[PDB]
Amino acid sequence: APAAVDWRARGAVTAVKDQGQCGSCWAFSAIGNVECQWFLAGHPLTNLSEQMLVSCDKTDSGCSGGLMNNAFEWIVQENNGAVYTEDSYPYASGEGISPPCTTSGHTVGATITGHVELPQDEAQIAAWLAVNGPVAVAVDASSWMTYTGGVMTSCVSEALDHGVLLVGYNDSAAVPYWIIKNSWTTQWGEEGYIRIAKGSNQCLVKEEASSAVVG
Numbered sequence: 370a371p372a373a374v375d376w377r378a379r380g381a382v383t384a385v386k387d388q389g390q391c392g393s394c395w396a397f398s399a400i401g402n403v404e405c406q407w408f409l410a411g412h413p414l415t416n417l418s419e420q421m422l423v424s425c426d427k428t429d430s431g432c433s434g435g436l437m438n439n440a441f442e443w444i445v446q447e448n449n450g451a452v453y454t455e456d457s458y459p460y461a462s463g464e465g466i467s468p469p470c471t472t473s474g475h476t477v478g479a480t481i482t483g484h485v486e487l488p489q490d491e492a493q494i495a496a497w498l499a500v501n502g503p504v505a506v507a508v509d510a511s512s513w514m515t516y517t518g519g520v521m522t523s524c525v526s527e528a529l530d531h532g533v534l535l536v537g538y539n540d541s542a543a544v545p546y547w548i549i550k551n552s553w554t555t556q557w558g559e560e561g562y563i564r565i566a567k568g569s570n571q572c573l574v575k576e577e578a579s580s581a582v583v584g
């Protein structure tokens with residue numbers, strides 16, 4: 370596997386966004402992964418819509434929570450593989466309320482054919498990431514309100530409660546780390562990003578990792 374890969378330095382990752390008061394982390398995780406996978410399939414990097422999932426994905430619960438894998442399959446099975454551009458369906462759940470779904474007036478910005486679920490093994494997750502790109506992951510984010518910067522070498526790891534995007538790793542650093550994109554604005558952590566130690570299942574990072582496959 371390569372020593373260090375950071376997909377941000379390869380034009381593959383869009384800017385950090387904000388879920389606001391809505392419990393929509395699952396939607397941000399799922400869409401961020403689709404955005405990166407579309408770019409790596411040889412298309413221009415385009416911002417895609419989390420609102421589409423929060424308002425229209427009735428197999429999840431909007432501002433109450435949801436699962437990245439249910440979102441990926443709602444796209445393929447209920448929305449004919451289509452993901453709308455963020456520009457044509459902007460975020461509207463910042464106040465913690467999800468408005469009724471709108472089924473027209475939007476534009477398709479990417480399509481996916483399905484999704485794969487990766488092994489519960491950090492080394493294996495890293496080998497796939499290095500070739501194929503960013504992966505959606507679920508974590509225990511209980512301690513993340515105290516994250517100020519640096520490599521978090523210890524993290525409360527006992528219940529998965531938040532979905533985020535894994536965009537790289539560096540195994541040649543003093544402590545190998547994972548690089549994670551979050552959705553609590555740029556004002557949190559390292560410009561919206563967090564680095565956690567890699568190799569000890571910090572914040573339960575290896576437990577629920579998956580990715581969309583483009584088509």
Ligand SMILES: *CC(=O)[C@H](C)NC(=O)[C@H](Cc1ccc(O)cc1)NC(=O)OCc1ccccc1
Pocket residue numbers: 391392393394395428429430432433434435436437507529530531532577
């Ligand atoms: C991050 C956030 O905004 C909130 C309120 N929580 C969720 O979105 C949870 C994220 C998560 C947690 C564990 C996983 O293994 C994966 C993602 N999800 C959660 O609340 O899942 C609930 C659910 C809703 C509808 C149908 C089935 C399950």
